[PDB]
């Protein structure tokens, strides 16, 4: 009875960052060496535990969130960051216990005529709270005269398309990101090693 990481990391389709996917992992044993054997392929930063010790640990839930961002935006996937992504798409707590894994995905997600399939939110009333998702597509009101659900002058579509070509300099290229969150609450533990 094993934990289904291959379903997150070997997924050929990945979510857009504004509608990021979450898989919940529980009721299994988590072999973190399946992930650490593959380290030439991702970048990886951990927060609140060490990478090596992960097998040793036990938690009440493990969460895996996945999405695609631009490379120079990977640095916002970290505690206490700001910018479009950290504030309007995906937000980590300050007390984040977990790992942020990322790999360059030019070859998978760029296309000579651009790939516009991946979206981000650029306007919102307020900065998301941690682990919050906004799928809403309703017109953001800038300016005073209110929009009637009609984009136009001072009224925007809140979602915007990345445009990915294989020519772009790294960091204007697409990166797949998996955020692993370790959550040890007060009920009985369920994920171990």
């Amino acid at each position, epitope marked *: 009875n094993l934990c289904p990481f291959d379903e997150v990391f070997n997924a*050929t*389709r990945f979510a857009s960052v504004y509608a990021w996917n979450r898989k919940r992992i529980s009721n299994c044993v988590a072999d973190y060496s399946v992930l650490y054997n593959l380290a030439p392929f991702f970048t990886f930063k951990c927060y609140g535990v060490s990478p090596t010790k992960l097998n040793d640990l036990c938690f009440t839930n493990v969460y895996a969130d996945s999405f695609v961002i631009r490379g120079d935006e990977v640095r916002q996937i970290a505690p206490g960051q700001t910018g479009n992504i950290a504030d309007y798409n995906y937000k980590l707590p300050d007390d984040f216990t977990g790992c942020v894994i990322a790999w360059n995905s030019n070859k*998978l997600d760029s296309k000579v005529s651009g790939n516009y399939n991946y979206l981000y939110r650029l306007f919102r009333k307020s900065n998301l709270k941690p682990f919050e998702r906004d799928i809403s597509t309703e017109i953001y009101q800038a300016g005073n005269k209110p929009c009637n659900g009609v984009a136009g002058f001072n009224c925007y579509f809140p979602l915007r398309s990345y445009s990915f070509r294989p020519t772009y300099g790294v960091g204007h290229q697409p990166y797949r990101v998996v955020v692993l969150s370790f959550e040890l609450l007060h009920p009985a533990a369920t994920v171990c090693g």
Partner: antibody
Amino acid sequence: QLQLQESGPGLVKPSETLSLTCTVSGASITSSDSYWGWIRQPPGKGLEWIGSIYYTGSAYKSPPLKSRVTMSVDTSKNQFSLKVTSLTAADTAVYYCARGRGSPPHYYFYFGLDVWGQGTTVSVSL
Amino acid sequence: YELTQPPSVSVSPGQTATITCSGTALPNHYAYWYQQKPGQAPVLVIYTDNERPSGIPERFSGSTSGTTVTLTISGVQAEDEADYYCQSADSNANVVFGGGTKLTVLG
């Protein structure tokens, strides 16, 4: 000009074991984006993937058949092989050599099965 | 793990055909479409959800929406009579093919 050609017997006895060989022409079997695989089709029925293999010997195997499938890459002679133990009637099919165009580490079908051999008919009878 | 696909679709000439394919892991994995004509190797007509390889006519186009993907063959010709296979992969990354749909050009 990537083309593929299956070799292999046409008749095999039940229980015996099946041996297939695909030769690659027009490209190196070491193409970093190539996952060489086998798909079969029982006469009258639909396609079934058996397994794929990278130029390193990394082998992806269908779960129904994992127990009795083996594959190998002859880097020297630009070809890959399939072996299926304990044939039964249910193993009668056309067997297709194919190239999955994908990307490392494990996207062995990312861009689809875009180039196919044209099949070797395999027939499992006593 | 199983992709579900109508056994037969029939279409008047010059008109437009819809092959749907449903499977619970299409949220995780792209769809692929292969065309097979009698006694012959399958031919990839759609990779990832909607990419058309080079020598494939524009009337083939792929579409996704949830746990269903669809091949759409605009302006059907007689040559388009074939067997069409959707292909994806299960929760793990295991390739799986649908059952296939005969496309009959009526009239």
